[PDB]
Amino acid sequence: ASPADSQIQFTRHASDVLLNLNRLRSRDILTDVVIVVSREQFRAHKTVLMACSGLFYSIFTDQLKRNLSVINLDPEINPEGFNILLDFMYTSRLNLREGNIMAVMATAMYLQMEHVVDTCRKFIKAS
C-alpha cells in the first residue's frame, strides 16, 4: 500500500483540472443542470456545484433530488452575484467590487460558501 503522503506531488494538477472543467463548461460538454436565477439561467456540472457550495451539496446528495436537471434559486437572488460565484467555483478567482460586494456576499450566504462569506467580510473591513 502507498500512503498519498509519500507520493510524487504535481503542484499544478488541481488547477489544470479546474481550468479544463471550466473549458468544458464553456462548450456545454457534460453539463447536467441549469440553474435558473430570475430571468437568467446558467448551465453547470453538478459535481462542481457540490464541491463548492453547501446548498448544492445538500440538494444533490439527497437521492430525492440528485437527478434534477433544473434548479430554481430563490427569486431574491441577484443573477450577477450568482454569476460571479459560479465563475469563482470554476476559476478560484473572485470578482469583488464596491458595486457588487453586498449582492455577492448575500448570494454566498445563500449558497453556503463560508470561506467566500468570510472574504466578503474582510473586503468590507478593508473598505
Ligand X SMILES: Cn1cnc2c(ccn2CC(=O)Nc2ccncc2Cl)c1=O
DSSP letter assigned to residue 62: S
Minimum separation from the CB atom of position 114 to ligand X (A): 3
Pairing mode, strands 33-37 and 70-72: parallel
109 counts as binding ligand X under rule CB under 6 A: no
Q: Which of 52, 89, 96, 105 binds ligand X (CB under 6 A)?
A: 52
Give the CA dihedral 34, 115, 47, 67, nearest 10 degrees: -60
126 counts as binding a copy of itself under rule CB under 8 A: no
Contacts of 70 (CB under 8 A, 6+ apart): 33, 34, 36
- Residues binding a copy of itself: number (CB under 8 A): 42
**Interface residues for a copy of itself in 68-107 (CB under 8 A)?**
87-89, 91-97
54 counts as binding ligand X under rule CB under 6 A: yes
